[PDB]
């Protein structure tokens, strides 16, 4: 299972924002994505963490860091903008055959 905390986060524009995605059991075969819900409530990929590396989809301000406890990850937005405000979630799947997607609950960012 995954959690994504804090469920509600407010920061002032220009500050960094950090959510934590906590997995009940991370392992090396998992690929961890950070998504946002779009204005049509569709999931849209922001960044991914796989093979120990964070890769942003379209904005390099979005990066994922694995914590020393292995099972938690920081999803960081550097230098927040107003329009970063919205609902985000994390999701994981194994590279192993027949794996099922798991998603966290949504968490809300409000940039002031």
């Amino acid at each position: 299972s995954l959690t994504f905390y804090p469920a509600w986060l407010t920061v002032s524009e220009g500050a960094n924002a950090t959510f934590t995605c906590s997995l009940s059991n991370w392992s090396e075969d998992l690929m961890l994505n950070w998504n946002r819900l779009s204005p049509s409530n569709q999931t849209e990929k922001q960044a991914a963490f796989s093979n120990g590396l964070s890769q942003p989809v379209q904005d390099a301000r979005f990066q994922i860091i694995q914590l020393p406890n292995r099972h938690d990850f920081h999803m960081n937005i550097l230098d927040t903008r107003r329009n970063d405000s919205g609902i985000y979630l994390c999701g994981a799947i194994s590279r192993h055959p027949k794996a099922k997607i798991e998603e966290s609950p949504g968490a809300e960012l409000v940039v002031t």
Partner: protein, 184 residues
């Protein structure tokens, strides 16, 4: 870099018809054919992956004969080596309340009649009665097919030479169906 898009997000489909669900990905991003896999995972094995479409950048899932229980939200997922993405697709299955059975029961000694409309469909219908001054009582059960059987009962003294209409409103489908009862 790797993402999945969905050209069409909501599929409205009638029970008994076919549907093909699709999400797409750019093969110029996912260049390595050997590492491509796709899955349609319901949010909660009827849909068949047409895997010859994967080299074309398309994850296509075919349901040849749709049932009510195919309705719901799905994650359309593609894995490209060590990256993946997904989109939500919504299947809205419709079974129209097209067959409305009607019944008339005379109530001894009152000059009143009990009128019934009963129909099966999906999702749940609400029932109104046109231009009457008495409230109706409507109930439902679910059938094993996943349809709702909705029954509405109205008791009144019929104004001579009036017909009575019961209207089934299927909100998700913006559909109205109706039956006209002539108590003569």
């Amino acid at each position: 870099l790797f993402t999945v898009t969905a050209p069409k997000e909501v599929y409205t489909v009638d029970v008994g018809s076919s549907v093909s669900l699709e999400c797409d990905f750019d093969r110029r991003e996912c260049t390595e054919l050997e590492g491509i896999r796709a899955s349609l995972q319901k949010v909660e094995e009827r849909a068949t992956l047409l895997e010859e479409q994967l080299p074309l950048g398309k994850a296509l899932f075919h349901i040849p004969s749709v049932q009510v229980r195919d309705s719901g939200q799905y994650r359309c997922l593609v894995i490209c080596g060590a990256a993946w993405d997904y989109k939500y697709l919504t299947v809205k299955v419709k079974a129209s309340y097209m067959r409305i059975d009607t019944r008339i029961l005379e109530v001894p000694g009152t000059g009143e009649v009990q009128l019934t409309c009963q129909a099966r469909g999906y999702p749940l219908a609400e029932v109104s009665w046109q231009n009457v001054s008495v409230p109706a009582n409507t109930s439902h059960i679910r059938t094993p097919e996943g349809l709702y059987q909705v029954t509405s009962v109205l008791r009144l003294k019929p104004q001579p030479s009036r017909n009575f209409s019961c209207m089934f409103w299927n909100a998700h489908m913006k559909e109205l169906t109706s039956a006209i009862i002539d108590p003569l």
